[PDB]
Amino acid sequence: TGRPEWIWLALGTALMGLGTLYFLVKGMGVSDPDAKKFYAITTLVPAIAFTMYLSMLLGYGLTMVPFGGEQNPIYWARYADWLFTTPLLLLDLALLVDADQGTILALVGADGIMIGTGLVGALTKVYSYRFVWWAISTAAMLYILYVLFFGFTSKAESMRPEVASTFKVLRNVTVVLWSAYPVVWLIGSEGAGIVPLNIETLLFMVLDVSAKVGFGLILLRSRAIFGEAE
Amino acid sequence: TGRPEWIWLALGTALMGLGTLYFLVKGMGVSDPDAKKFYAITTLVPAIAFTMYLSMLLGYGLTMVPFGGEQNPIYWARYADWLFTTPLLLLDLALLVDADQGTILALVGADGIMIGTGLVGALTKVYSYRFVWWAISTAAMLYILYVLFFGFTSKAESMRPEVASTFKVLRNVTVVLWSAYPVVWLIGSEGAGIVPLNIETLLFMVLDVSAKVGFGLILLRSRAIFGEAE
Amino acid sequence: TGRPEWIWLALGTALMGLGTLYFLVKGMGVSDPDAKKFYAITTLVPAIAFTMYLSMLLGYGLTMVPFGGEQNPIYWARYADWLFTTPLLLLDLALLVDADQGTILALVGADGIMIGTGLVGALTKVYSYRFVWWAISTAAMLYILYVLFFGFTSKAESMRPEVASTFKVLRNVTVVLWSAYPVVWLIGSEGAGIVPLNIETLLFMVLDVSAKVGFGLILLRSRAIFGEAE
Ligand SMILES: CCCCCCCC/C=C/CCCCCCCC(=O)OC[C@H](O)CO
Ligand SMILES: CCCCCCCC/C=C/CCCCCCCC(=O)OC[C@H](O)CO
Ligand SMILES: CCCCCCCC/C=C/CCCCCCCC(=O)OC[C@H](O)CO
Ligand SMILES: CCCCCCCC/C=C\CCCCCCCC(=O)OC[C@H](O)CO
Ligand SMILES: CCCCCCCC/C=C\CCCCCCCC(=O)OC[C@H](O)CO
Ligand SMILES: CCCCCCCC/C=C\CCCCCCCC(=O)OC[C@H](O)CO
Ligand SMILES: CCCCCCCC/C=C\CCCCCCCC(=O)OC[C@H](O)CO
Ligand SMILES: CCCCCCCC/C=C\CCCCCCCC(=O)OC[C@H](O)CO
Ligand SMILES: CCCCCCCC/C=C\CCCCCCCC(=O)OC[C@H](O)CO
Ligand SMILES: CCCCCCCC/C=C\CCCCCCCC(=O)OC[C@H](O)CO
Ligand SMILES: CCCCCCCC/C=C\CCCCCCCC(=O)OC[C@H](O)CO
Ligand SMILES: CCCCCCCC/C=C\CCCCCCCC(=O)OC[C@H](O)CO
Ligand SMILES: *C/C=C(C)/C=C/C=C(C)/C=C/C1=C(C)CCCC1(C)C
Ligand SMILES: *C/C=C(C)/C=C/C=C(C)/C=C/C1=C(C)CCCC1(C)C
Ligand SMILES: *C/C=C(C)/C=C/C=C(C)/C=C/C1=C(C)CCCC1(C)C
What we know:
Chain A is mainly α. Chain A has helices at 6-26, 33-57, 77-96, 101-123, 127-156, 161-187, 197-220, and strands at 62-67, 70-75. A two-stranded antiparallel ribbon of chain A has the order 1-2.
């Protein structure tokens, strides 16, 4: 393809596809109802990402947005992916710690605001206003990270030790990886335009595969996803 | 801004923002799991409205629709707000009366039809057909109001007296305020065009703040949102 | 109207409308909470389809997509219908057999991928790539049909005999009817273009009414939707 970033979109498609197939085969035969929930959530995540990476590779998930006096290539398909995959990742963490329903609704709702405002920012034609939406989205992200540390960590330590241990690892992975996304957006083609689109696409591919397939490998190898039984 | 209705969009943004912050601080420290559910639902409502009012203020949430031989300004962001906030408001009422799952699904589904058909009507280019969609949406609204009076009132009176009392007030607020929306649409810029857009925008701002922040102030001050405990 | 397929859109609108009204009246007075769930899910299905058939009849739900060097009429409103009605139909089947939550999430998620990739395929401007999306969507469909036969049939036979019996019939109806959709798409205006749009529209109308109103008549006449009580 004639876009230099094609190679990273192709690799991302392949890695999300391979991760989906691996999780699908690994979950074959699992009969524990708690483990089935985690396999279902965790396999859906790279499956959705696979479809949206493929849409970017083939050019469907790209649009041109005028701002700063240029026509700027915006990959809108990222937001369609993240709208569904980021609440699913949060549901994996919430189910692990048996979070109450009100906390789950708060997290999923804040996450929806985060991604939706990011999408508005990405498509906004007045340059200075793009950063207003970025700030609102980032505030929603900070709310999510606060709950994961000062609601979820406190509950986990009261549960089975393998649940506490696996939650603590996946919480730390999540906070580090998710915090990089607003930074890549700010310095890349959607924001200040300091990093070119080809490098930005590489960075999001590394983050996405780590936050989805890496995350899932840790979770689905854990004893924490099974009920305690004899 | 050069649009006369800007002042009402600005005030609406500010009031939804202030209401979100108030509910967020008030819900700090609440540990009762039932109360947490109500705080989460009720704080999300003005937070979503805040983002969509801001999108209208900055001009993102506006499009031009040709009908009647003119280019007509249609604020489409209202429907994106209401798609999520109106089912959340109904969930507050349904949880208060411990409604059965089938009734909740009926209400949320009718509400989705109401808002979705309103959006189609708002974007329809053949003038006479706009009113066909308005009629279908209004029928869905009447179904909702019927359930709130002839399903929900009957259940409430069988529950704790503080639940019955708070439900009856919030039901009455809801029926009065929600019934005004189809009337404003019909006589305003989306419909017959008798009331100008600046006044229409004022009317929806008053209704929205009352139906979201007013509603939430009544609910979150009530004893009904807490479990009965010693 | 000047489109030859109008007659089938009109008939489909009428039949979905009549089926909605019939199910609404039949469900009046039902007080069993399990039966209420099934009436709510099953009445919503033709109600949503009614609105989307009407949008196609009036011309709102149609767009033109260039591919193969022509402007091709694509009825996009079908996908908006199916996005909501196909998971509702699967929920009817899953509730009947008391499926576990993980299996329900797998089914609904695969169904979302099926319809979303179908929509991307329908709107794709590069002709050969339309069939890549068709293949991905069809793979998701095959996953769904596998679960209905090799997860759901095995559970049903362990339940009440009237539940097993009604599930087996509705499963067979579902597999036969749903399998025809990818074939109609492939040979019709969205795909290879061998069957003209007027005949394609007839075929989808027959399938839709059978898969929604036919399905619902079988289910809502069954004893299986009521709890076992004295
Ligand atoms: C997990 C095991 C594998 C670990 C792998 C980690 C990779 C993640 C980071 C990649 C950034 C690469 C940056 C590449 C920078 C090239 C940009 C460039 O060409 O910049 C020069 C320009 O011409 C003038 O400034
Ligand atoms: C809660 C405590 C505060 C209560 C506040 C309630 C306000 C709600 C209603 C406002 C309608 C105002 C209508 C303003 C009409 C002005 C339109 C106008 O200018 O019309 C004249 C025109 O030039 C030729 O007909
Ligand atoms: C339930 C009881 C009622 C059962 C009813 C079942 C109907 C379903 C199938 C219809 C296909 C009809 C196909 C009509 C074909 C006409 C196309 C045509 O005109 O093709 C000739 C063309 O001019 C040169 O090839
Ligand atoms: C001027 C101020 C403007 C408005 C501020 C920016 C709005 C968007 C940002 C963040 C979303 C905040 C989180 C929304 C969800 C809160 C849920 C909540 O309150 O949950 C309580 C529950 O007890 C928990 O377990
Ligand atoms: C419990 C459930 C909670 C759910 C919480 C969800 C909150 C989402 C809020 C705001 C983002 C809205 C974003 C809307 C973006 C639409 C952009 C679009 O499609 O624009 C069309 C065109 O490109 C230009 O007119
Ligand atoms: C806890 C997780 C938080 C995650 C969110 C952290 C956000 C703030 C980070 C960086 C902003 C630094 C300033 C970037 C703006 C630079 C503007 C500019 O003009 O830069 C010129 C350029 O450096 C040469 O050409
Ligand atoms: C010609 C007729 C055309 C069709 C009519 C217009 C369709 C749209 C209008 C209203 C939605 C109706 C409500 C949809 C949901 C009904 C749910 C239901 O039946 O719920 C039963 C349950 O027992 C409860 O607890
Ligand atoms: C339990 C879950 C129940 C959920 C019930 C939901 C029912 C929604 C039904 C119909 C409205 C569909 C509205 C679709 C509007 C799309 C308009 C649009 O985006 O148009 C694009 C462009 O502007 C022009 O081609
Ligand atoms: C229970 C809640 C129900 C809520 C829904 C109630 C709907 C009917 C209300 C009003 C319609 C009145 C007729 C409006 C149409 C007027 C058309 C016209 O030409 O008006 C000329 C104008 O009055 C001078 O220029
Ligand atoms: C190169 C390969 C590319 C990727 C493949 C194509 C992706 C889209 C197709 C099918 C969706 C598959 C189903 C997605 C949901 C799986 C859910 C699951 O694993 O559920 C386990 C649970 O135990 C159950 O009860
Ligand atoms: C538990 C919840 C699981 C939910 C699982 C859902 C999976 C959906 C995945 C992919 C399809 C995405 C389709 C996006 C299509 C948007 C097309 C569009 O609107 O295009 C705009 C314009 O026409 C051109 O730029
Ligand atoms: C279990 C359910 C599975 C459902 C899915 C089954 C998919 C495969 C079916 C048919 C493809 C047959 C080939 C169609 C392609 C024909 C291409 C062509 O050029 O046809 C010329 C035409 O026949 C004269 O003009
Ligand atoms: C699978 C993909 C993941 C986990 C993606 C996560 C994305 C975010 C945390 C995005 C956050 C953003 C902001 C906080 C500000 C605006 C830009 C966004 C959407 C990139
Ligand atoms: C927070 C906002 C609220 C509670 C908005 C409520 C909106 C409605 C009840 C809208 C109803 C409409 C009709 C019944 C007919 C068509 C026009 C609509 C969407 C305005
Ligand atoms: C009420 C409508 C129903 C039950 C519609 C069902 C539709 C499908 C099973 C569609 C499947 C498709 C594929 C498997 C491939 C691509 C084309 C689709 C969307 C037609």
